[PDB]
Amino acid sequence: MAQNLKDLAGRLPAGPRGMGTALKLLLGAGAVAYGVRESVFTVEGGHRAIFFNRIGGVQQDTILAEGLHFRIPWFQYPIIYDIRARPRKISSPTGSKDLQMVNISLRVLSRPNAQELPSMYQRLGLDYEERVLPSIVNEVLKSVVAKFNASQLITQRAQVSLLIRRELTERAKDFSLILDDVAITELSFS
Amino acid sequence: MAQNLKDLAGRLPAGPRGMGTALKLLLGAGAVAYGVRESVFTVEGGHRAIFFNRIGGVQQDTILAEGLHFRIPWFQYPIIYDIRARPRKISSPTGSKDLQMVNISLRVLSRPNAQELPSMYQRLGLDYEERVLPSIVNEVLKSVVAKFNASQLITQRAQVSLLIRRELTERAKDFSLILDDVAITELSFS
Amino acid sequence: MAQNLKDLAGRLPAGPRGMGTALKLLLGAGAVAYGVRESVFTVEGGHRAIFFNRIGGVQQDTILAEGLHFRIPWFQYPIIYDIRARPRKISSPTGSKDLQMVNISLRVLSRPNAQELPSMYQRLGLDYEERVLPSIVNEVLKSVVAKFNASQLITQRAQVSLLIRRELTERAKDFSLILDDVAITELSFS
Amino acid sequence: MAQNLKDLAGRLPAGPRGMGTALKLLLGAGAVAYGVRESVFTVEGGHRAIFFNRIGGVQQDTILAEGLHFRIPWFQYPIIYDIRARPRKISSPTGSKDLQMVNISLRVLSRPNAQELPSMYQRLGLDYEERVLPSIVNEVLKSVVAKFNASQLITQRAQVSLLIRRELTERAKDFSLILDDVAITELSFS
Amino acid sequence: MAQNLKDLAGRLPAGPRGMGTALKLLLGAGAVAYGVRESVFTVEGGHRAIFFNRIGGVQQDTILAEGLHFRIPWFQYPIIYDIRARPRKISSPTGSKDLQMVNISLRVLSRPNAQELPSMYQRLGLDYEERVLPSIVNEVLKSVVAKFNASQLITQRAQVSLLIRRELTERAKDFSLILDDVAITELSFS
Amino acid sequence: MAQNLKDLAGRLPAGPRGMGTALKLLLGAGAVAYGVRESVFTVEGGHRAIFFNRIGGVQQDTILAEGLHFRIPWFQYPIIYDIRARPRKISSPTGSKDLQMVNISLRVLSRPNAQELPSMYQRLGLDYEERVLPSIVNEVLKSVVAKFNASQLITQRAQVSLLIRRELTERAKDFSLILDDVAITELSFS
C-alpha cells in the first residue's frame, strides 16, 4: 500500500523520447568494443598476471599463474611478462691455470617453471634478464676458466660444464626460481 | 477465429518509431562487423580446434580437425595450436664407453598429424616442449653413449643413427601419439 | 489501362521519413568498405583462387589461375596460397660406399608451373611442401649418396647432381606437375 | 525577363532536413577518407604506376615513372612494383674445357632506371625475376665454363668475367631496357 | 545606420535546429582526427623534412633540420628520409699488382648530418645508399688492389686503409654531405 | 536565498530537446577514445620520460624514471628512449710498439641508471652513440696498442683489457654518467 511505488512506474513510460535515444547509445558501445578488442586484462592463457599502480615503482617483466579476474578494481595496471625462445651465447678465450690459450663459453636458459614472478619482480634487481643474464653467464665463466685446466678442457668441452653445472644452479636460483639445463658449445685455442 | 492474431501481424507493417530508428542499427552493425573480421572462433579449415574455460586449465600446442563449431557456449575459449617449423638440436660429446671420448646426439620432432590434441594437452604438458626436448634428447645420448661405442665412435652417426631412433621412438610417442621422423647431425672428436 | 502504374511513379517525387534516413545509409556504406579493404575474395596480385565449404572437407594452401568472380555464391570460402622465395637446404654427413665420412647438401626450388593446386591440394597429402620437401630431398639423397662414391665426390660436388636430377624429377612430379632445377651445394669430409 | 530563373533561387530558402542532413554528408566524407588513408592510386615516393583490367590479363612486378593521376577512370586496377636491394649469388664448381676442375660464380643486378616495366610486364612472361635470376646466371655460368679454360680462369676470376660482360649485356637486354654491371666473386678448386 | 553591427547579432541565432545540428559537426571532427593519428607532416624530433609537389621528380631520400610547420600551404607533399644503422660490406680476394691474391673489404657508415639532403638529392639520383655504396667502395676497393701489392696487404689489412682513407674522403663528399670513417675489416688469400 | 543562485538552477537545464542532444555528445567521446588507445603520453612498463618543445630536434635518446605526468602542457612533446640490446664490436690488428703483428680490440657499453638522460640528452648529443662508439673505441685502441708491447698483450687478451678498463671508465663516463662494463673479444696475429 503506497502511492510512491505506483507513481514511479508512471515515470518509466512517461517521456518515451528518452527510450528512443537509448538506441544511439547501443551503437556507440559496438564502436567502443573494437578499441577494447585490441587490448584486455584477463590473462588469456600460457601467460601469468602481475600488479602495479600509477603512483609507485612499475613492475619489471614477471608472470605467476592464470586466474579469472579483470583490471576493473580502482588502481591496478596492465603489464605482464610473456615467455619465448631465448638466443644468447658467446665464445670467450681465456686461460689462467695452464698457460697457452684456453677458451671457455657458457650460456643460461630461461624456463617458465613454478610461479613466483611477482615476488622476484623487485627482488630480481634492476632491469630484467639482460642485467643478470650476461653477468651470471660471464661471472661463472670467468671464475671457472681460472680453476679448470686447459689439458682437460681440450679433452671435452662438455666436461667443463659438469663442474659449472653446480655453480650455475645456485646462481640463477639465487635471483628467482626456474629450471634451466647446463650445457655449452665451446671451442678451445692452441 | 482469434482477432488478436490479426492485431499482432498488423504491427509488422505498422511499427512504432522503432522502424525508423531501426535504420541506425543496420548502419551500426556494419561497423561492429569490422571488429569481428580481426578475430573469430570457427576454425578456418587448415587448423584444428581446442577447448578450455576461464577457470584454470588453459590449453595450447593442440589441434584435431575442422568443423563449424567454436566459442558458441559460455564456458569456452579461443586458443589453438598452429603448425610451424621447429629448430632445436645440439652435439653432445661424452666419453665413457671408448678409449678417449665419443660424440652422440639426437634431435626430436613433433608433428600433430591426427590423434586428438586436447586429450594430450594436459597430459603432454602445457608448453612442456622445451622441457621434454632437452630432457629426452640429453638423456638418450647419455644412456646410449655408455652402452657401447669404442670403435663405433666414427661409424656411430652412421650405424647408431638407427639405435638412437629405436629408443627415441618409444620416448617420443610416450608423451603423446604422433607420426614424426627424427635424425641428427653428429660429429665425433678424435 | 492501369492507374497503379501512375501511383508507383509518385514514390520518387516525395520527402517522407525514409528519405531523411536514406542518407544515413550512404554514409555508413563508406565505413563498411574499410572492413572489406583489409580482406576480399577476387584474386588480386599474381595469385590463384581455390574453393571449399564449411564441412569436414577443406581447401587451403593451393592456387590455380586468375578469374573475375566474388565469393558471394552461397557456400564458398576464401583460403588461397601465395608464391615467394624458398630457402630450404641442409648439410648431411653419411658415407659407406667408400669411407665413413661424406657430407652432402641439396636445395629444392618452388615454381608454380601451370596450375593444378586444387587437384594436387588433397592429393599432395596433409600439410603442403613442408612434408614432401624434406621427405624427398632427404630420401633421394640418402638413397643416392649410398650408391655414389666418396673419391668421386671430391672430383666435383655437381657431378652427383646429374644422377639425382633423373631420380628427383620422378619424385617431384609424383606429387603434381612442376619444373624444378637440380643442383647441390655441398662440402665433403675425408 | 525569365521567371524560371527566379524560381530556382526561391528554392534555396526552403531546405528543412536537406540543409540539416546535408551536414551528415560532410562528416561522412572525413570517415571515408580513413579507408583511403591505408591505400591509394596516385603513386608516391620513388615508385612507378602500372595498369590492368579485371577481364584483361593482370599487370604486376613492373614500374614505369611518376605522374599525377587517380585510378578513377572506369576499368583500371592498382597493382605496382617497388624497388629494393637484391641479394642473389652462388659458388658453382664446373670443369670441362680442362682436365682439372674450375669454378664459375655469377649474379645479376636489377635497376629501376629507364622506363619499360609495362612493356616488359607481359614480355617478361608469367614469373618475374625468380625465373630470370637463376636462369641467366646458371645458363651463362655453365655455357661460359665449357668454352673458357681452367688454367685461364684460375689466373684471375675477373679475367673470365670480361668475356661474360659481352654476353650478359645481350641476355639482360631481354628483361625490358636496363643496364647491368658484370662482376662476380668466385673461388676455383684445384 | 551601423547595419553591420545589427546583422552580426542576427547571425548568432540560426534557428533552434541550427545549434542542435551544430553538435553533430563537433563529433565528426574527433573522427577525422583518428585517420590523422596514423600519419602527419610536422617532422617529430629525430628526423629532417623534405619538400615536393605533384609535378615532376618526387623527392623522398632527403632530410632538413627540424622546424615547426605543417603540410598545409597549397602544393607540398609528405615524403621524408629516415636515418638508422646500416650494415653494408663485402669479403673477396682479387689479384692484379702481384701474382698472389690481394683481398680488400671496407664498410661505410652513415652519420646523422643535416647539411642539405634536398640540394644534393636531385644531384644524387635514385638508389643513393644502394648504388653509391658499392660504386664508391667496390670501385676504390677492387681498383686499389692493382695499385698496392699482396705481400704488403697480408702484413696488415689496416695498413692499406691509410691510403684509401684519403680517397674515401673525396668520394664521400662527391655525393651529398656526410662524414665517413676510415677502417677495413678483411681477410686475404695466399 | 539570492536570486542569482536560484535562477542558475533554471539555466542549467535546457528543455527536453537540449538534454536529448547531449546524448550524441557522450557517444562521440567513445570514438575519440579509440584513437587514444593506439597512443598516449604517460610512460608505461620499465620506461623513463623525456621532455622537449616544438622548435628543433633534441631530447630523444633519454629515460629517467616513472611518475604520472606526461604531455600535460602545450610546449611538451612525446619522444622517449627505450632500453634494448646493443651489438657493437671490432677486432683491430695493428703493430707499432713491437716488431711482429699484435692485435688490440676494445668495446664500450652504455646503460641507463637513474636521473641522467634528461641532463645529458643535449651534452651527449641526439643519438650520437654511433659516432662516440667508434670514436672512443678506435681512439683508446690505437693509444693503448702503441703504448704496451705485443709480448705482454699476446700473453692474454684479458691483461691488456685490465689496463684499458681505467682509461675507458674515464672516457665512457665523460659523455654521460652511467654504470656499464666494457670487455672485448680480442684475437692476435702471429
Swiss-Prot record, chains A, B, C, D, E, F:
Query: Which sequence positions carry the modification called Phosphotyrosine?
Result: Y128
Q: Which intervals of the chain are annotated as region Necessary for transcriptional repression?
A: 19-49, 150-174
Where found in the cell? Mitochondrion inner membrane; Cytoplasm; Nucleus; Cell membrane
Write down the superkingdom of origin: Eukaryota
Gene Ontology CC: one annotated term: nuclear matrix
Q: What induces it?
A: Expression increases approximately 3-fold upon entry into G1 phase compared to other phases of the cell cycle. Also induced following inhibition of mitochondrial protein synthesis by thiamphenicol.
Query: Where are residues bearing Phosphoserine located in the sequence?
Result: S151
- How is the protein modified post-translationally, according to the record? Phosphorylated. Tyrosine phosphorylation is indirectly stimulated by IGFBP6.
Would you kindly state one Gene Ontology biological process term found in this protein's UniProt entry? negative regulation of apoptotic process
* Residues bearing PTM N6-acetyllysine: K147
**Main localization (coarse):** mitochondrion
**One MF annotation (Gene Ontology) recorded for this entry:** nuclear estrogen receptor binding
- Modified residue N-acetylalanine is at which positions? A2
Tissues expressing the protein? Expressed in myoblasts.
Q: Where is this region: LC3-interaction region?
A: 121-124
Task: State the UniProt keywords alphabetically.
Answer: Acetylation, Cell membrane, Coiled coil, Cytoplasm, Host-virus interaction, Membrane, Mitochondrion, Mitochondrion inner membrane, Nucleus, Phosphoprotein, Receptor, Repressor, Transcription, Transcription regulation
What does the record note on quaternary structure? The mitochondrial prohibitin complex consists of two subunits (PHB1 and PHB2), assembled into a membrane-associated ring-shaped supercomplex of approximately 1 mDa. Interacts with ESR1, HDAC1 and HDAC5. Interacts with ZNF703. Interacts with STOML2. Interacts with ARFGEF3. Interacts with SPHK2. Interacts with COX4I1; the interaction associates PHB2 with COX. Interacts with MAP1LC3B (membrane-bound form LC3-II); the interaction is direct and upon mitochondrial depolarization and proteasome-dependent outer membrane rupture. Interacts with IGFBP6 (via C-terminal domain). Interacts with CLPB.
Q: Which family does it belong to?
A: Belongs to the prohibitin family.
Protein's job: Protein with pleiotropic attributes mediated in a cell-compartment- and tissue-specific manner, which include the plasma membrane-associated cell signaling functions, mitochondrial chaperone, and transcriptional co-regulator of transcription factors and sex steroid hormones in the nucleus. In the mitochondria, together with PHB, forms large ring complexes (prohibitin complexes) in the inner mitochondrial membrane (IMM) and functions as a chaperone protein that stabilizes mitochondrial respiratory enzymes and maintains mitochondrial integrity in the IMM, which is required for mitochondrial morphogenesis, neuronal survival, and normal lifespan. The prohibitin complex, with DNAJC19, regulates cardiolipin remodeling and the protein turnover of OMA1 in a cardiolipin-binding manner. Also regulates cytochrome-c oxidase assembly (COX) and mitochondrial respiration.
The written remark on domains in the entry is: LC3-interaction region (LIR) is required for interaction with MAP1LC3B/LC3-II and for Parkin-mediated mitophagy.
Name listed for the protein in its UniProt record:
Prohibitin-2
Native source organism of the sequence: Homo sapiens
Q: Span of the full-length protein shown?
A: 1 to 190 of 299
